[model samples]
Target: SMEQVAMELRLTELTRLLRSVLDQLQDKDPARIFAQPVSLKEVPDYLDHIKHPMDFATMRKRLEAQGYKNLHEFEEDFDLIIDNCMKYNARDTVFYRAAVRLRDQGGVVLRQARREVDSIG
Candidate 1:
């Protein structure tokens, strides 16, 4: 069961790191635009453009459910949020600008987490 023990240890580390990353995103998003799912009325063509929509609330739920296999997967969803915004909104819009900010700041934390966990493996 040595491998199992290591797996558990790694998961524990990942969950903690992922939680911090999520916390940073939540704090960075004061406007709360990315807090919930996008409504049909808000963006009529949202669903048409973005095939896989992701938001902070959904990411929080997935994290609590232990759905992500690794930091890479969690980071993937993290980037998705920013990507979705940029894809749907024009570069001139506020949402697009916020996504850029989040990508810059949030990306740093995720990279820090990866570096922190590298020793665990």
Candidate 2:
């Protein structure tokens, strides 16, 4: 549960960062800022990995193996994903959804994810 708490805090920080970015971008031309307009389908994938980083790392590895290097260039991509999860929603829907699922199902996947993040640090 501590992991979840820490993650929630980190997610909050990310959301704040995104809000700041969005505010700054609001005055700029949308085409110049966003590659594409934000969409609903993007929400799930962003939240899913932020709830657990190792799973994301696996996905990252696969993406990298396929030559997807831009987003994978920094750890901040993971943070940005989580940030988007919150910024895109006025309410904390993404985080609440992940927390509920994590509460209902505790497993090795989460454990491994936490360990992986720790190792990265």
Candidate 3:
């Protein structure tokens, strides 16, 4: 039907327009910013690209200083911060994304942190 085609085309045009704007909104050369690769991941969870990894390092420190005596404590504060950041569309989702990273501080996340510091000239 003509109506169905028109409706489908409407959505198709929006998707193309959205893709164009989304490209501009993101860092053009995410790799050029720093040596480490930054990326987005989607699945049962979503991971936003890390911009200033150092900002997250400091945030991780602050969370530690708060003395999250239990996972409940950690989760309470964690969810608040994460939820707010997400709802308000804040750019740096790294802190919450790196919560597991901070706790694990034992793998790729730490390696990247090492790079950020090693080369923070």
Candidate 4:
């Protein structure tokens, strides 16, 4: 329950910040340029083409082909992926701990993401 609450709060804050930033950018330039939202399910597909060495050449080729100039172009989508990963991992931990008759572990994984909020500068 704590994990669920924390996740919801984090989602709310992220959405709010995104909206505020977008609004500010729009005010600066009515024709603000931004990449379209890419589904989180496509992350693995995008990651698949990445080379072993992880150079900008490969990243640029893959992402530019996908219409994104760089990884930062998908900042919001990246946040979504990270949030979902934390949520799913937290859920799995909670399930296993409960299944084995142990104490609560649901909120542990989510704590990592919560720490990110504090470091936001």
Best by TM-score: 1
- Which candidate do you rate higher for TM-score, 1 or 4? 1
Ranking of all predicted structures according to TM-score, beginning with the best and ending with the worst: 1, 4, 3, 2
Clash count for each candidate, listed in order shown:
0, 0, 0, 0
Q: Model 2, 1-121: lDDT tens per residue? A: 9998986665554444333333333223222222232333855565444443322333334433432222223334434434554454445564435433332333333344446445643
lDDT of 3 by residue, 17-58 (tens): 333322332223232221122233322132433222222223
lDDT, candidate 4, 8-114, per-residue tens: 66655655544443333323322211123223374555444322222223333443344332224534333333343343335567423332221122133234334
Better of 2 and 4 by lDDT: 2
Candidate 2, residue 38: lDDT: 38
Tally clashing residue pairs in candidate 2: 0
Model 3, CA-based lDDT: 0.36
Top-lDDT candidate index: 1
Q: In the order shown, what is each candidate's alpha-carbon RMSD?
A: 1.8, 17.4, 19.6, 18.0
Q: What is the C-alpha lDDT of each candidate?
A: 0.86, 0.40, 0.36, 0.37
Which residue runs of candidate 1 sit more than 4 Å off their true CA positions?
1-6
Per-residue CA lDDT of model 1 for 3-54, tens digit only, reads 9998877777677778887998778888897999898897788898999999
Model 2, runs deviating above 4 Å: 30-121
TM-score preference between candidates 1 and 3, better one: 1
Where's the lowest-lDDT run of ten residues in candidate 1? 112-121
